[PDB]
Amino acid sequence: KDPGRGLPVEEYHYGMQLDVKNVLHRTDNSTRTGVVPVTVVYEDHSGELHKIRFLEWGGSTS
Amino acid sequence: KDPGRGLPVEEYHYGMQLDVKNVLHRTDNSTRTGVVPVTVVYEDHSGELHKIRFLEWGGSTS
């Protein structure tokens, strides 16, 4: 439904190894070009959820 | 056509301010989940092209 509900944004570092079992939410940046914000909610193998927010390149070219 | 033709991969750092006028190529990672490689070719305001390769989260959830 809304997997981000009630989760704080946690510390994230580009390139860091995470324990990602499932990705439950990610911002739809398909139409965006260049660097844009993205929020991810993922589930780890223990079953805990994690919300992270960072930057990525949008899904479109110019 | 193929904007990556004849370009070396250049040094890139997550979070670095770049001079991006146009994005000419980016890997189609729409179907991927979790962290995956991505290559971008972009044009700067001077008109020069730049190829960079790094990691991003795929465009899909689980």
In angstroms, rounded to a whole number, what is the distance separating the alpha carbons of residues A16 and B35?
10
Residues of A with CB below 8 A from B17's CB?
A: none
Which residues 6+ apart lie within 8 Å of B20 measured at CB?
Answer: A34, A35, B42, B43, B44
State the residue for tokens 């899909």. Answer: B60
User: Could you tell me if A9 and A27 are in contact, meaning their C-beta atoms sit under 8 angstroms apart?
Assistant: no
Alpha-carbon radius of gyration of chain A: 12
Asked if A40 lies within 8 A of B55 by C-beta distance, the reply is: no
Asked if A59 lies within 8 A of B59 by C-beta distance, the reply is: yes
Strand partners, B40: B26, B52
* B interface residues, A as partner, C-beta within 8 Å: 14-15, 18, 20-26, 30, 33-35, 38, 40, 55-62
- Which CATH superfamily includes the segment(s) B1-62? Protein of unknown function DUF2790 (2.30.140.50)
Picking from A16, A1, A2, A9, the residue whose alpha carbon sits closest to that of residue A50 is A9
End-to-end CA distance of chain B: 33
In angstroms, rounded to a whole number, what is the distance separating the alpha carbons of residues A13 and A28?
21
Resolution (A): 1.3
Asked if A59 lies within 8 A of B33 by C-beta distance, the reply is: no
The ranges assigned to domains in chain A are: 1-62
